[PDB]
Symmetry: C3
Amino acid sequence: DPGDQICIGYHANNSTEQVDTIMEKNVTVTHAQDILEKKHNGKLCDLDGVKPLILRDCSVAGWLLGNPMCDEFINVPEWSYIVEKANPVNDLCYPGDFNDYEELKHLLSRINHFEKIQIIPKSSWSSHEASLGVSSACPYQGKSSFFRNVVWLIKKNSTYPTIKRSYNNTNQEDLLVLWGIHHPNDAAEQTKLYQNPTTYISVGTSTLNQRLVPRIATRSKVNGQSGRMEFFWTILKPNDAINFESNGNFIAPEYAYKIVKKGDSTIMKSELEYGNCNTKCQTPMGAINSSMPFHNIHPLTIGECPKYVKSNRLVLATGLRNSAIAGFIEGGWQGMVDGWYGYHHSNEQGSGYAADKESTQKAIDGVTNKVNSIIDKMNTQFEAVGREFNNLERRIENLNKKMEDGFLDVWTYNAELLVLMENERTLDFHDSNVKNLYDKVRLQLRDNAKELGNGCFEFYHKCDNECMESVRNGTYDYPQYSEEARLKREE
Amino acid sequence: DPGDQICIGYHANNSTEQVDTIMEKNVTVTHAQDILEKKHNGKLCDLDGVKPLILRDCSVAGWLLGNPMCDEFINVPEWSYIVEKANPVNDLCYPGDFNDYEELKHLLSRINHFEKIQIIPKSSWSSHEASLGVSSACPYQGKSSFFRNVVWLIKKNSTYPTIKRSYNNTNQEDLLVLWGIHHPNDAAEQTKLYQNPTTYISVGTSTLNQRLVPRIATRSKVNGQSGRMEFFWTILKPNDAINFESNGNFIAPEYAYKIVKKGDSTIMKSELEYGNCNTKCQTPMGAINSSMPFHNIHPLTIGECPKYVKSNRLVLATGLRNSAIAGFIEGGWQGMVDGWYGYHHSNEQGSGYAADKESTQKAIDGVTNKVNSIIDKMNTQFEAVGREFNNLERRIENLNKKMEDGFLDVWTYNAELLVLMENERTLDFHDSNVKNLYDKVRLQLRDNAKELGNGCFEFYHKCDNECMESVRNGTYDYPQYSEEARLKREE
Amino acid sequence: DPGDQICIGYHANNSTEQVDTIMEKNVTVTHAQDILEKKHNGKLCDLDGVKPLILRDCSVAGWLLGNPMCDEFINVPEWSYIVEKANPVNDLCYPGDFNDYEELKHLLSRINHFEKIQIIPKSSWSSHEASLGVSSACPYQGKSSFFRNVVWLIKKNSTYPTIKRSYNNTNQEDLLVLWGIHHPNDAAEQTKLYQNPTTYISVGTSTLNQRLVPRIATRSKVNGQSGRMEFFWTILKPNDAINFESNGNFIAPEYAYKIVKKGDSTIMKSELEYGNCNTKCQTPMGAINSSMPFHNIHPLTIGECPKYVKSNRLVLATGLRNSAIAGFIEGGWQGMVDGWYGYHHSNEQGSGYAADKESTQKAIDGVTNKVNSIIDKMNTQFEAVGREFNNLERRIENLNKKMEDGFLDVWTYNAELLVLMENERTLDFHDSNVKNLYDKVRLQLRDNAKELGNGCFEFYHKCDNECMESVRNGTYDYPQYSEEARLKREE
Ligand SMILES: *[C@@H]1O[C@H](CO)[C@@H](O)[C@H](O)[C@H]1NC(C)=O
Ligand SMILES: *[C@@H]1O[C@H](CO)[C@@H](O)[C@H](O)[C@H]1NC(C)=O
Ligand SMILES: *[C@@H]1O[C@H](CO)[C@@H](O)[C@H](O)[C@H]1NC(C)=O
Ligand SMILES: *[C@@H]1O[C@H](CO)[C@@H](O)[C@H](O)[C@H]1NC(C)=O
Ligand SMILES: *[C@@H]1O[C@H](CO)[C@@H](O)[C@H](O)[C@H]1NC(C)=O
Ligand SMILES: *[C@@H]1O[C@H](CO)[C@@H](O)[C@H](O)[C@H]1NC(C)=O
Ligand SMILES: *[C@@H]1O[C@H](CO)[C@@H](O)[C@H](O)[C@H]1NC(C)=O
Ligand SMILES: *[C@@H]1O[C@H](CO)[C@@H](O)[C@H](O)[C@H]1NC(C)=O
Ligand SMILES: *[C@@H]1O[C@H](CO)[C@@H](O)[C@H](O)[C@H]1NC(C)=O
Ligand SMILES: *[C@@H]1O[C@H](CO)[C@@H](O)[C@H](O)[C@H]1NC(C)=O
Ligand SMILES: *[C@@H]1O[C@H](CO)[C@@H](O)[C@H](O)[C@H]1NC(C)=O
Ligand SMILES: *[C@@H]1O[C@H](CO)[C@@H](O)[C@H](O)[C@H]1NC(C)=O
């Protein structure tokens, strides 16, 4: 009247943080953690402390050849990836074509060193016209102009002598060389420009064995030209020579480019400001500090990235299902201000709540380890995802799309079920921990106390604060009170 | 002599439905659900309410150029995918080659609008022979003939004047234009047919800059021709002009094709009847109503499909392990005609079975949610899987095969283990639910009853139907009978 | 004073074998099993009982054409894959190019039958010079030489008559035919060698329609040649003829190759000895007997292989957490010399340990089934992983790398978490089994014994070895001792 009591119970709090499990939707819970990165900084950033190459209104081709309307950032000796607009305004001012363009974009996507040099001075053309090679398709300061890196040679007097030019690459570094051929409209234009009616450009390195011949066709005007310029490139290894021979129609190099290539990346289509941030993962919509193993921002990423996932929320339960003084069977304790599982006693020294420190540590550690494993086991490689295929490579683009879409489906399904399965396992761990604590006590006390049915025991003897601590420590000397218990029990 | 009794037990039934778990093979179970679609309708069907294009004995090339033996469905203004036989009977009647054929098949795989028009009337050839261009390789009504969409121009009198033809595309829609070059056997045939010994075809759009030249070689007869016809195509954007100029050997357009292209699909190899069904997933062996997240019919699918899996059966447990009156420890109850877990009482008002409605709902809901999650979380995108690569693209075909085979291995393993893991979890949930119900009762009754060891309690007091309901409701007033219990207990 | 006793306990042993679980790192455990193959034999081996093709210092091209410095294993009628060194010493002695080389390597990667034959005897050149076609780029026995499979025809007297040669393929098997064109330095060399200033090679099968024309350019010396040899191949189906016609610059066939092609494989880069072993999985670093479902040796494998994984250890728990006479609550029993779970009794016939045979079998079977499922459910297809793309196919190489790196990330993550999740499930199974055994006994004995709190019961009656066996059998007749128990209990 009335006997000393110890109850087993668990933490509860004012949290409304919800969670899904394989078996129940929308379960309220004590603490939760999202494993899905949703947040970008909305800017293009260095990658591993190397600037991008931003081409505001130029294309790579425009940029390389010197489209004279390309008002771009000129000096920039190294980059990690390239940013083009979707359809750049300024491409090939004079209509034509860039042979193996997509392969050259991919090669220029990440460069360790890039330095333009002069290989063939515009001044060394003694027996041809350097400065007439000019068009109203390629306007500069209101006047007609041309690509600035490459010389459109015309006949001088009424003569176009055969050209012979070797350049030997005496630099330490691979040289990227560009040249072109002019495809004129008719045999009139051919002779008007080059005198010789039948022409060729021949180019040879140790690798290259090229003989180009102009093609006449009747073609629709583009930038008011029916002519076409067709451009070619090669990489001149650092002790080789390139050898040009031409009768006519030659768009000769002035400027080449020293390159040092140390692994690839890609070209990103984006409308964003550089931001002076560093990052290890860049997106068309912005960069990411990628601690989380999943993101849902954009598929077309460059760097060490979280796996892209079609998903709004990946939330793991970390805490508990959230809902004398009665114990566990009836609900959680707001009063358990600290600890996850534990006790409420009441004796002659008075009542209160105590944490089971030992079984609360085991569980915080377990849940923490569960969360870190799901995060830390994620293998994170460098990748560069772009669209590097032209309108005659659609079969290969469709191969790429099945692969991307394939991996998106695997990660999205697996992450979704991983969260649902481990949430069901986390809430059952908490149940299993509370019930093991009931049984820890039940098995110490045996007949020295009676199970009240609600999570509590009423003692058959006096249990002061020091006896209570021995129950919580698992050091309860049952023989020391079996005598006193037996007397109150029999009655 | 003898006391009132309540037992805890679970449903059992005549089911032989088996299931595998990570730990036990072939476990009999109360109800099961297959998550593996195995059933097709054996027919080719519309896709998203758009007909396929069935080419019974033609190839796409045959079909486009007008191989005159191609007896096909002529009118058909739009399609979602194409069906060819494996090796069609009718291809190129006159032997030769179709430039960039596989890219053109992929472009024509799904078309929003397709309308043949005449761009160059067969009648407009005033200074050349339209109607002699004919061969016994391309037989029609027993007589020698040719491709019907394209004109094989021969010299008139003994003259082949230079051809100049612009067509301007004044339609609203992109035009697909086809032309050809004849590669003859020798300089005799060349002049016999075209007079001029040295010829060219030149074709120019705003895009295209082509000059074809016939090639002589000594070639093996095919359909009794040693000649070769080589065909070319382009897409004429809706305000551009195409410009032909030819000396000879020109296979000119008569008919072109208006196309509107809204995303791609592929070409399916199949021997099946159209069936007037609609579907969202088509297979070479038949269509699928794809509610299930996995199928095992065929890899080469077009649509939103279940993931293809190498597997006979993916069966999830939904029910229970299947095997006074004794309770749970001894087996299941055929008498539990309704509900999964519950009770059998016997008192002075008589005996019977009662469901634990509350804990049976929780579990049906849980299992239902488990099954729906495993199904609903499956991300389902449109994909079109074909073999779009020729016998010089084998490296790219092998890239495609590693990717397909790679995803088949991931899904097949993951689905197999997902079923085994969640089956072990489902059967342990049912164990855990029954035992929690034993403990619900055990904890209400305490010493007012004795555990019989077999799943049952014998009461130490009179428990009529209304007391029993309070045990099942969890509203058992123990103080109301501790007195009467204590008297029968002490004795 | 003192009463008969039965305790429930579990196996323990001197094991230090550790294991990780989703929730605890470094858990000591009774027995463990690695599922990660780490061990290769360090040798190149037959694949499915078919030898590889080892090219010690040759390239495939060198090998095919007969680079006379290629001292290789000559006779070898069939192979399963090819081994080249990274950069072979001996390639094209005379500098040039092999058209569609990578596609030909992939076609020759696995051959069912390969037999060189003579199609055009070196002796049949009556009106040209067979034996002058020779260079100091292609040295043999100190003297100048050439490719041995192919004849460099020079003019005889000062004449190079037009060549006409059909070969008809009267063998049962596809023929691989090789020829070349010489691209000379200038019109002097052209006429010095071939007399005719303007030349062509024309080649025609039922498939092929080729006209090659030599290209002059000024080119850097390679092996002291500025000339270039460019080689071409085709497959002559078994009743077709190939037809050569040449004016000059013709590198004619002597030897062709009978091939029978039955599915593909790839070219492996490795520095290893053949070893006369058979295997079903080959690695650049050595072969594997692939019973395990995961390996971490090398990505570039050929055969039925374990999935490649970035991982040091995949270790599954199979045994138990490893740590009167007290039962389970206090730790494991070294004395439980045999069985996983069971009993220690002590009565008047004396004390000892007994296995619960029934519940130990269930569990060994369960764990064995868990391990076999994780291994046996692994779908294992043939694949051949190589690097089959040249320095202008980098976009397709980058597609391949994302796919490989993609699958490495999926398998590595999934295997890691599968081990951690199933380890946590295995240790909780063992807990759940021991506690069910405590409850098996507790529920048989009821009040005929008292729970000592530590895993033990003290009996309220005499329990000889035969009573004890009935407790372990689950056949304990409680009515047979309730009388004797009640007397000792009341007191
Ligand atoms: C879960 O919660 C949200 C409210 O935040 C609600 O839209 C949804 O309907 C709830 N229930 C289920 C079963 O999804
Ligand atoms: C071109 O150069 C000069 C005149 O400025 C003259 O000597 C030369 O012969 C001219 N050639 C012709 C063919 O008109
Ligand atoms: C085609 O016709 C239209 C309208 O008559 C004209 O504006 C257009 O420029 C023509 N296209 C070409 C390139 O001639
Ligand atoms: C547990 O509690 C008792 C009572 O306060 C105390 O004497 C003892 O130090 C504790 N035992 C252990 C092992 O912590
Ligand atoms: C499972 O059941 C089938 C009979 O339907 C049988 O073939 C098989 O051998 C059984 N047992 C095992 C271990 O697979
Ligand atoms: C071809 O056309 C007519 C005869 O039908 C004649 O006027 C013309 O000159 C003929 N040409 C030749 C070169 O025979
Ligand atoms: C090759 O020889 C066979 C048998 O003599 C002959 O039937 C076949 O047509 C020949 N092939 C060609 C295309 O000449
Ligand atoms: C449970 O059972 C008792 C006895 O029939 C009944 O009076 C009461 O309405 C029920 N209580 C609840 C909360 O359903
Ligand atoms: C696990 O064990 C190894 C010693 O073999 C040690 O390096 C490591 O630090 C241990 N602990 C953890 C938390 O990884
Ligand atoms: C080459 O062959 C013989 C001399 O050996 C001679 O009959 C023939 O005319 C020679 N030709 C020329 C053009 O010198
Ligand atoms: C380029 O110049 C270097 C050094 O003067 C020389 O050794 C080298 O051979 C030259 N290259 C060629 C192919 O001429
Ligand atoms: C179990 O043990 C008892 C006592 O030894 C023995 O009589 C009986 O044969 C056993 N019962 C069964 C079903 O094995």
